[PDB]
Amino acid sequence: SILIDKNTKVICQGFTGSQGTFHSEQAIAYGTKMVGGVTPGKGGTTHLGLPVFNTVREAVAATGATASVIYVPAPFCKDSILEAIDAGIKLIITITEGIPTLDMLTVKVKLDEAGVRMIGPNCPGVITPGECKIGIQPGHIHKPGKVGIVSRSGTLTYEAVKQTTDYGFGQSTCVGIGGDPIPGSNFIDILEMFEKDPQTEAIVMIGEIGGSAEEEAAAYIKEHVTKPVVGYIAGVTAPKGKRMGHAGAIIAGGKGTADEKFAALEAAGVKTVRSLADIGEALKTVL
Amino acid sequence: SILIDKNTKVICQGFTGSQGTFHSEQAIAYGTKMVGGVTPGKGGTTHLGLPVFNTVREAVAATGATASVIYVPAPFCKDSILEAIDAGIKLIITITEGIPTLDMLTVKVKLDEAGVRMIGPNCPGVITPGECKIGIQPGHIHKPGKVGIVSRSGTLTYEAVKQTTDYGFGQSTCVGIGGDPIPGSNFIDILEMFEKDPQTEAIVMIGEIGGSAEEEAAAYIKEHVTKPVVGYIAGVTAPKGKRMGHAGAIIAGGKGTADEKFAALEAAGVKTVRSLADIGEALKTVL
Amino acid sequence: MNLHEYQAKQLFARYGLPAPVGYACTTPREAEEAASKIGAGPWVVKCQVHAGGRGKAGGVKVVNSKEDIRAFAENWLGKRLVTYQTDANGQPVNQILVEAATDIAKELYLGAVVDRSSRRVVFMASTEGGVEIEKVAEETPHLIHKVALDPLTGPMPYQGRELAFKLGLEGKLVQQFTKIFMGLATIFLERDLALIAINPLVITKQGDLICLDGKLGADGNALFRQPDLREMRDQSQEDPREAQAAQWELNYVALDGNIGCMVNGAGLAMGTMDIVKLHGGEPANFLDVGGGATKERVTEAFKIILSDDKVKAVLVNIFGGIVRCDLIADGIIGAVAEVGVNVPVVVRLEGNNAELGAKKLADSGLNIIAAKGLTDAAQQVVAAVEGK
Amino acid sequence: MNLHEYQAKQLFARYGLPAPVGYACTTPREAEEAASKIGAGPWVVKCQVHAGGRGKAGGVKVVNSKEDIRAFAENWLGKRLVTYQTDANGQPVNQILVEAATDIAKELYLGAVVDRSSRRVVFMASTEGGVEIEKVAEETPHLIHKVALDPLTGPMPYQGRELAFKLGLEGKLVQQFTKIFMGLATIFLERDLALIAINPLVITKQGDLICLDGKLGADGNALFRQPDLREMRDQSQEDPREAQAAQWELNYVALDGNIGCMVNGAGLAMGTMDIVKLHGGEPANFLDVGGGATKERVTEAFKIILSDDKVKAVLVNIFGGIVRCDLIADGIIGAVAEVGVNVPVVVRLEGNNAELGAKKLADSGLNIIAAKGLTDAAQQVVAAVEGK
């Protein structure tokens, strides 16, 4: 697997809020090791049977948590991610949507110099079927297995999950890198993790319009990823210079089209299923 | 030797100015390989028989220079150092005095993430007796040799130079790390370079009041520097909280006194000559 | 969000950057009075819409008389300008910019965007102004120069000098260019812009740089901390349903096709659109709901999708979310009865009660299908329009 | 450079930070009129000098009547306050701050400096306000909390919350503290400060944080880009010779001893002072010339060093610089005749013409020695005062 396993201890920033409460309740029931949460002002109380702290450092000191999940509103998110990096947290999963691009521009530089991994922001999710679930996803369509999945989309991932669970194939770990234009981690970052994961036998790459991250990934795949890869790009029928939901879903200056990405991948040896119905199918091939 | 040798090719920023012209004329006559200079607006002309460029990148492209010497006024210095880092320059020697501390605070972080070495700012100087001279110093008191010298002071260095040249001892390389509170390089940085330099057989460390760089150096010396070290700290009679010339020469909050530094060093096994008259002498011992 | 050329120029003014003297006018009288205030002609009059190519569409002209200014103002105000950058429906012209004409010596380009690839704000300049720059990049990419703002230091002057020298600027123009680079770089950071485009950045006969036109794009995600840019939003420039969906927490993007697509999640929404098209369909829109798929939200999603009279079917494709697959079915049922949805509705549910809900749908009797899969719900809505 | 408490508080006001209502007054009438404007007593009156411990020196008092305010104002204005942080000569009091008294619940400390060791701006807070903090650091260092400003991100709120929680603040005080941390952090960066010290940062009986006192130190190196701080320099607070030397491009720092030291280069200047002291001497000052050792500069250096009537010898120690070791000797000669230097002058030259110049000096006949080395010029000036 990658990023997380049964041992990952997780704290939650924005834990006593609606989404943090709800999703922690989920992570908890999935067996995920939520060891606590952080909410400035509510330190000293307990929520979901776990301890609630005033600062991330207090939390890390008290629990040894190494990963943090963030459900803090956009306006306060940069402060949140930075507090986490400062506190020692090594893996951050930022669910928050709507973080200003210029904030992510800075946070990305910080994460990189600081040797911290961030999945997100904007609804990513990480789940290692069987061991750990940090996210808002539906883990009863998941099946401990051999397929590694990276996607800029939450719901599109679910489809792929079901298809691999249905072909019995299973999922090593599923990573939702989020929908923003500057994410904490991108395809190449996670692809490398899958290439090195003994448990991951096949990789399903899920892109969409905008950016050239897929194209860049293709090239990386073509020279460093030996395991088989099945890729699907959403948004072939998307209009240009129009945001398709995701802050990052947008074809700017006629570049980053769904076809370009398909092309790039195909040119790197990637089973590109033209329909998201045939992802499970295409895996059946190469696998 | 360290930092520079007969092969270092040097460009000069602020080259067509008074100090840049004068000191380049010196470096030139010492055999130093000035391959050119940069002055926005005067690109395309020649000065001192060398080519003058509009940007540091133009200069680096044209000459392959790897080191840059900066004589740009304080107000424009940060822009200068950053241009140099951007252009590929790997060694920067900033003579300029009066650069705002907060600018050096930023430049220091930049130099470190960028893998660039900066000696300075504030009148440092680097000279490898025989091979290369980048600085404003007097190289006819220098003698190719075996003593390595690091000093926060220009003139105090000269004394030490003369004493080692007079005892025939010689100088591997002499580094003036400058008088500002946040320098591009400090004692430990240069000490490590000397410990690893075959040619350097003895190290002369020259400190003064302010900061705790010496104290930190002592500790480093005590555990990583095997070669012998002779240290002298100026400012035993200096009053507190009073700037003694050097922006960094100041005892703040009763810390960073001349005695503390002497002490720290002595406690790390460093021949601490109480008089700068006995530096040559004390070297004669350990050496 | 986009701003109008006049708004970009106002902003440019506040940051001391240079632009033609002009007035945004809302009436023909205001427009004609602008001429007098501006000075001696001729004058440039400009329809203020968000799209480009207004000139080729004849929405930008140089007049020599107040009588012509007024003409142009009466002609355009209240009408829709259609350029090669707007849909055939065009955009309403509610302000006309009247500014002094300029004596153009040369036309340059200066712009900035957040480069996803380098994850830096990147400024680009070219000697090729007055032209669609995406083309200058295609044809002649060596004529485009770039610099990325270091996020640790802020934009630096050498960076503007770097671009000025590459553009072959000299003397006072180098300092003017550097000044504009720094100011535009500052507006970009302070106002959380997504885009800047001075095309053309003009060198005048009199020898100075001046922003002849200006296109600013703000990061919508930052509007909470940009109150001034917040009040400048002009909704009349956007498809009203987008503002409608947004207010309801839906993300809508109208398309040409005839099959309405209502999905939860942007990636799914796009894959769904794509799969409908894969099977001979033609997606009429992109609508992404997500979680909160309540009855009203699902009904609002319907109203919005069905406002386009060319919609001849509606494909619902849910997958998870906070709502149970059957409460979602009752919500659809009610939306169909209530909205009196007059078209076949194919539903693809997934998650809790995928069938107690797929049942409820078949049990209604309403012309609501209940697909058995994706490639299926695909073929089914594609079918449900075959010849209509 | 240092600012006055009132100036720090003005600055605090502009950044919306909280401080007592008060008026800096230059006359007893202005001071007494302050009381009325401030409101109901009592009032705190404060001599405005740069040093601390004004209170223990009795330069800070709480009065209950306008008649006392005036008293205090007449008493101090135009006189010199000597505190444990000024030389026995003290500093002139030209402004008296009259501010409303405060109801102190608790006293805290909040300060910032550029930490040389971490090369970061570091904010420190302690529950130990109203006390010399260097001591709180010594005695009880666990009671001091710190945070370093990340130069890539700017100060962040969590950092102020971190300090607020460590100080055990709660509720509204946590947000107030965070607000002040951010504002002080912003003044530090924007105004290129070298130092901030809110001692005491007070929690009031009414439950709010307020800056009862304020000490700001600006980075002199940045004054070119800080025009406002530039106009606030108060020279009357500094030894006038320092301003004099500086204007002449010399760096002067008066000391107690009797041997004037004129060296080129701060490090040498300090080593020279040190070597004179090593040999029973007692350095009367620190004066660093550097390069430009012209005749006037060397004569100005003399005037400045000799203004201290306790100087009983002047040791010159040059070493290089742009001027030839003999043109330096003629400059000394002339300064000795002209200034009519009335004391033995030992010169240690080094570089070009070290002897054509050491000669010229002996050949003059002026009571100008010409040392043969350092440990020598040491003993020689030390000698030249033995019992005078």
Q: Are residues A127 and A199 in the same domain?
A: yes
Q: Which of B89, B122, B155 is the last residue of a domain?
A: B122
Nearest to B55 by CA among B44, B39, B71, B67: B39
Q: Which of B157, B224, B159 is nearest to B193 (CA)?
A: B224
As a residue count, chain A comes to 287
Q: Could D277 and B276 be called an inter-chain contact, meaning their C-beta atoms sit closer than 8 Å?
A: no
Give the Cα separation of B31 and A121 in Å (integer).
Answer: 56
Asked whether residue A158 is marked as a ligand-binding residue, the answer is yes
Alpha helices in chain B (DSSP H): 18-29, 56-63, 74-87, 101-114, 155-166, 187-195, 213-224, 258-266, 279-286
The sign one gets for the Cα dihedral C174, C176, C178, C184 is negative
Q: Tell me whether residue A16 is annotated as binding.
A: yes
Contact in structure between A71 and A49 (CB atoms under 8 Å): no
DSSP strand pairing (B33-38 vs B9-13): parallel
d(CA B152, CA B250): 13
Question: Given the DSSP bridges, would you call strands C43-47 and C60-63 parallel, antiparallel or unpaired?
Answer: antiparallel
| Pairing mode of beta strands C251-254, C285-288 | antiparallel
Determine the 3-state secondary structure of B94 from DSSP. Answer: strand
| Whole-number Å distance between alpha carbons of D68 and D83 | 22
Q: Which residues of C147-183 are buried (b: 16+ CB within 10 A; e: fewer)?
A: bbbbbbbebbbbbbbbbbbbbebeeebbbbbbbbbbb
Q: Do C62 and C2 meet the contact criterion of CB atoms below 8 Å apart?
A: no
- What is the residue whose two structure tokens read 């790897």? B66
Q: Identify the CA nearest to C347 among candidates C338, C367, C339.
A: C367
Tell me which amino acid residue B30 is: Y
| C-alpha span between A95 and C122 (Å, rounded) | 27
For residue B250, give both structure tokens: 């100041």
In 3D space, the residue among A283, A266, A254 whose CA is nearest the CA of residue A207 turns out to be: A266
Instruction: Assess contact for D332 and D295: CB atoms under 8 A.
Output: no
Q: Do B17 and B149 belong together in one domain? A: no
Residues 111 to 150 of A: which have CB under 8 A from any D CB? 113
**Mutation test of the interface with chain C: which of D149, D150, D152, D225, choosing the one with the most C Cβ atoms within 10 A?**
D152
User: For residue B106, with 0-12 CB atoms within 10 Å meaning exposed, 13-18 middle and 19 or more buried, which class applies?
Assistant: buried
Same domain flag for A70 and A135: no
What is the interface size between A and C, counted as CB pairs within 8 Å?
Answer: 157
**Based on the number of CB atoms within 10 Å of its own CB, is A255 exposed (0-12), middle (13-18) or buried (19 or more)?**
middle
D50 and D91 Cβ atoms separated by less than 8 Å: yes
Residues of chain B found within 8 Å of residue C157, distances taken between Cβ atoms: 76, 79
Task: Report angle CA C155, C157, C160 to the nearest 5 degrees.
Answer: 90
CA atoms within 13 A on the CB side of C345: 31
Q: CA dihedral in degrees (D26, D31, D32, D35; nearest 10)? A: 150
How far is it, in rounded angstroms, from Cα B182 to Cα C29? 63
Tell me the C-alpha distance between A226 and A242, whole Å: 36
Alpha-carbon span B204 to C93, nearest angstrom: 77
Question: D interface mutation test: which of B104, B140, B152, B155 has the most D CBs within 10 A?
Answer: B155
- Report CA-CA distances (Å) from D303 to D270, D309, D318, D335, D340: 20, 11, 18, 9, 10
User: What angle separates helix D295-306 from helix D240-248, to the nearest 10 degrees?
Assistant: 170
Does the distance separating the beta carbons of D373 and B245 come in below 8 Å?
no
A224 catalytically annotated: no
**What is the signed CA dihedral for C132, C138, C144, C146, rounded to 10 degrees?**
100
Report d(CA B271, CA B285) in Å as an integer: 9
Q: How remote is the C-alpha of D220 from its chain's centroid? A: 11
Q: How far is CA C196 from its chain centroid?
A: 14
Residue A128 annotated in ligand binding: no
* Alpha-carbon torsion (B232, B235, B241, B245), positive or negative: negative
Tokens encoding B50: 């060398």
Query: DSSP per residue over C342-363, as a string?
Result: -S-EEEE--STTHHHHHHHHHH
CA gap D178, D156 in Å, rounded: 9
- Quick one: chain A helix, strand, coil %, rounded to 5? 35, 20, 45
Contacts of B116 in chain C (CB under 8 A): none
Strand partners, D81: D91
CA distance linking residue D318 with residue D315, whole number of Å: 10
Indicate yes or no: CB of B110 within 8 angstroms of CB of C152.
yes
**B112 & B17 share domain:** yes
**Strand duo C96-100 + C43-47: pairing:** antiparallel
Spatial contact of A120 and A94, defined as CB atoms under 8 Å apart: yes
Q: Which residues contact A46 (CB under 8 A, 6 or more apart)?
A: A52
Side-chain-side CA neighbours of C82 within 13 Å: the count stands at 4
Q: What is the identity of the amino acid at D151?
A: P
**How far are the Cα atoms of C240, D25, D100, D206 from residue D29, in angstroms, in the given order?**
67, 8, 17, 32
User: For residues C254 and D41, what is the distance between their CA atoms, to the nearest angstrom?
Assistant: 70
- Show Cβ contacts of residue C195 under 8 Å, excluding neighbours closer than 6 positions: C111, C112, C113, C215, C216, C217
Q: How far is A106 from chain C (nearest CA, A)?
A: 6
Interchain contact, B79 vs C158, CB within 8 Å: yes
Question: Same structural domain for residues A275 and A133?
Answer: yes
In the annotated binding site of D for Mg(2+), the residues are: 199, 213
Resolution, angstroms, 1 dp: 2.7
Detail the residues of B annotated as belonging to a binding site: 16-19, 42, 95-97, 158
C86 Ramachandran zone, left/alpha/beta (phi>0; psi -120 to 50): beta
How many Å lie between the alpha carbon of D374 and the closest alpha carbon of chain C? Answer: 46
The tokens of C120 are what?
């830096």
Instruction: Please give the backbone phi and psi of residue B168, each rounded to the nearest 5 degrees, phi first.
Output: 70, -20
Which residue is listed with tokens 């539903």? C347
Choose the closest CB to C158 out of B83, B106, B110: B83
Token couple for D260: 């004037």
Phi, psi at C328, each rounded to 5°:
-70, -35
Cα separation, C381 vs C259, whole angstroms = 7
C163 contacts in B (CB within 8 Å)? none
CA distance A9 to B27: 60
Alpha-carbon distance B283 to B160, whole Å? 10
Domain end point (choices A122, A137, A159) = A122
Task: List chain B residues with CB under 8 Å of D113.
Answer: 252
* CATH value at residue A109: 3.40.50.720
Task: Please enumerate in sequence order all residues whose Cβ is within 8 A of that of A72, keeping only pairs 6 or more positions apart, or say none.
Answer: A13, A14, A17, A79, A80, A96
Question: With contact defined as beta carbons under 8 Å apart, do C328 and C348 qualify?
Answer: no
Question: Which residue in chain D is spatially nearest to A113 when comparing CA positions?
Answer: D152
Distance CA D145, CA D277 (A): 40
Question: In sequence order, what are the residues at sequence separation of 6 or more whose Cβ sits closer than 8 angstroms to the Cβ of residue D386?
Answer: none
Nearest to A111 by CA among A85, A148, A137, A89: A85
Q: What is the DSSP string of B111-128?
A: HHHHT-EEE-SSS-EEEE
Locate tokens 């009865």: which residue?
C337
- Cα dihedral C14, C18, C22, C24 sign: negative
Residues A248, A211: Cα–Cα separation, whole Å: 7
Question: Do A102 and C286 lie within an 8 Å CB cutoff?
Answer: no
CA distances from C182 to A143, B225, C126, C169, C371 (A): 54, 47, 17, 16, 57
Rounded distance between C-alpha atoms, residue D46 and residue D69, angstroms: 10
User: Is the CB of residue B242 less than 8 Å away from at least one CB of chain D?
Assistant: yes
Q: Which chains touch A (3 or more CB pairs under 8 A)?
A: C, D
Residues of C in contact with D152 (CB under 8 A): 151-152
In which order are the strands placed within the sheet that holds C60-63? C22-25, C96-100, C43-47, C60-63
Which residue positions of B form the known binding site for CoA?
16-19, 42, 95-97
Which residues from D are below 8 Å from B232, CB to CB?
271
Residue B157 neighbours by CB distance under 10 Å: 28
Q: Which residue has the tokens 């679910």?
A: A158
Phi first, then psi, for residue B118 (nearest 5°) are: -125, 130
Residues B130 and B78 in one domain: no
A18 is in an annotated binding site: yes
Nearest CA in chain B to C169: B41
Considering only CB atoms, which chain B residues are within 8 Å of D378? Answer: 277
What is the 8-class DSSP label of residue A225?
-
Q: Which chain B residues touch C174 with a CB distance below 8 Å? A: 40-41
* Token output for A99: 């973080």
Nearest to C186, CA basis, from C15, C361, C13: C15
Q: Per DSSP, what are the bridge partners of residue A214?
A: none
CA separation (Å) from D25 to C210, D5, D19, D64?
50, 13, 17, 18
- DSSP for C206-269 reads TS-EEES--EEEE-GGGGGG-HHHHHT--GGGS-HHHHHHHHHT-EEEE-SSSEEEEESSHHHH
Q: How far does the CA of residue D160 sit from the closest CA of chain A (Å)?
A: 11
Sign, CA torsion D18/D20/D23/D24: negative
- Domains of chain D plus CATH, in order, are 1-20+105-239 (3.30.470.20), 21-104 (3.30.1490.20), 240-388 (3.40.50.261)
Nearest CA in chain B to D285: B238
Report the Cα–Cα distance between both ends of chain B, in Å, rounded: 18
User: For residue A84, what are the domain limits?
Assistant: 1-122
Chain-chain contact of B55 with C150 (C-beta, under 8 angstroms) = no
Same domain membership, residue B76 and residue B175: no
What is the distance in angstroms between the Cα of B79 and the nearest Cα belonging to chain C? 6
Please tell me the distance from the alpha carbon of residue A144 to that of residue A128, in angstroms, as a whole number: 7
Q: Are residues A58 and A4 in the same domain?
A: yes
Q: Is A284 annotated as a binding residue?
A: no
Query: Which two three-digit tokens encode residue D117?
Result: 């060791």
Q: Could you tell me which chain D residue has the CA closest to the CA of C151?
A: D152
Which is it for strands B9-13 and D80-81: parallel, antiparallel or unpaired?
unpaired
Nearest to C253 by CA among C236, C270, C268, C230: C270
- Whether residue D158 and residue A55 make contact (CB cut-off 8 A), yes or no, is yes
Using the beta-carbon criterion (under 8 Å), do A82 and D150 form an inter-chain contact? yes
Element of type H or E holding A22: helix A18-29
| Residue A50 parent element (H or E) | strand A50-53
Supply angle C-alpha B204, B208, B214, rounded to 5: 65
HEC profile of chain D:
CECCHHHHHHHHHHCCCCCCCEEEECCHHHHHHHHHHHCCCCEEEEECCCCCCCCCCCCEEEECCHHHHHHHHHHHCCCEECCCCCCCCCEECCCEEEEECCCEEEEEEEEEEEECCCCEEEEEEECCCCCCHHHHHHHCHHHEEEEECCCCCCCCHHHHHHHHHHCCCCCHHHHHHHHHHHHHHHHHHHCCEEEEEEEEEEEECCCCEEECCCEEEECHHHHHHCHHHHHCCCHHHCCHHHHHHHHHCCEEEECCCCEEEEECCHHHHHHHHHHHHHCCCCECEEEECCCCCCHHHHHHHHHHHHCCCCCCEEEEECCCCCCCCCHHHHHHHHHHHHCCCCCCEEEECCCCCHHHHHHHHHHHCCCECCCCCHHHHHHHHHHCCCCC
Statement to judge: residues B144 and B107 lie in one domain: no
- Which two structure tokens, joined as six digits, stand for B159? 């004394």
Q: Which two tokens stand for residue B153?
A: 């002071």
**CA separation for the pair D126, D136 (Å, rounded):** 8
Structure tokens at C6: 């006049």
Under DSSP, the state recorded for C311 is: -
Count of CB atoms within 10 A of residue B285's CB? 12
On whether the CB atoms of residues C118 and C130 are closer than 8 A, the answer is no
Find, among C12, C184, C168, the residue nearest to C113 by Cα.
C184
Q: Are residues B186 and B254 in the same domain?
A: yes
Instruction: Tell me: do B96 and B142 sit in the same domain.
Output: no
Residues in Cβ contact with D142 at an 8 Å cutoff, skipping those fewer than 6 apart: none
Same domain, residue pair B128 and B106 = no
- The conformational region for residue C280 under phi > 0 = left, psi -120 to 50 = alpha, else beta, is left
B158 in contact with D, Cβ within 8 Å? yes
Contacts of D117 in chain B (CB under 8 A): 211-213, 216
**A281 membership: H or E segment, kind and range:** helix A279-286
Task: Please check whether residue D321 is in contact with residue B158, taking contact to mean a CB–CB distance below 8 angstroms.
Answer: no
**CB proximity under 8 Å: A 198-237 to C:** 206, 208-213, 216, 232, 234-237
* Cβ-based neighbour number of residue A124 at 10 Å: 28
Residue-by-residue DSSP string for C19-80: ---EEEESSHHHHHHHHHHH-SS-EEEEE--SSS-TTTTT-EEEESSHHHHHHHHHHHTTSE
Beta carbons within 8 Å of B13's beta carbon, 6+ residues apart: B20, B37, B38, B39, B56, B68, B69, B70, B71, B72, B80, B83, B84
Q: Which amino acid is at D168?
A: G
Kindly identify which residue of chain C lies nearest to residue B113, measuring between CA atoms.
C152
Give the number of B-D residue pairs with CB atoms closer than 8 Å: 157
* Phi, psi (deg, nearest 5) at residue C32: -65, -30
Residue D354 Rama label (left phi>0; alpha psi -120 to 50; beta): alpha
Contact B28/C135 with Cβ under 8 angstroms?
Answer: no
End of a domain among B122, B137, B163?
B122
Residues of D in contact with A56 (CB under 8 A): 158
Find the closest chain D residue to B212 by CA distance.
Answer: D117
SS3 call for C110: strand
Torsion region of C351: left, alpha or beta (phi above 0 gives left; psi -120 to 50 gives alpha): left
Elucidated via: X-ray
What does the block give as tokens for D272? 């020279």
C2 to chain D, closest Cα gap in Å? 28
The encoded tokens of residue D312 equal 């009983």
Distance separating alpha carbons of residues D132 and C215, to the nearest angstrom: 57
The CA radius of gyration of chain C, in Å to the nearest whole number, is: 26
CATH number for the domain spanning A202: value is 3.40.50.261
The reply to whether residue A55 touches residue D157, judged by beta carbons under 8 angstroms, is: no
Three-state DSSP at A118 gives strand
Q: Looking at the 3D structure of chain A, how many domains does it have?
A: 2
Strand, helix or coil for residue C325: coil
One-letter identity of residue A216: E
| Phi/psi at D267 (5° precision) | -65, -45
Which neighbouring-strand residues pair with C114? C121
> Which chains have 3+ CB pairs within 8 A of D?
A, B, C
CB C189 within 8 A of CB C177: no
Rounded Cα distance between D138 and D290, Å, is 38
Residues B82, C162: C-beta atoms closer than 8 Å: no
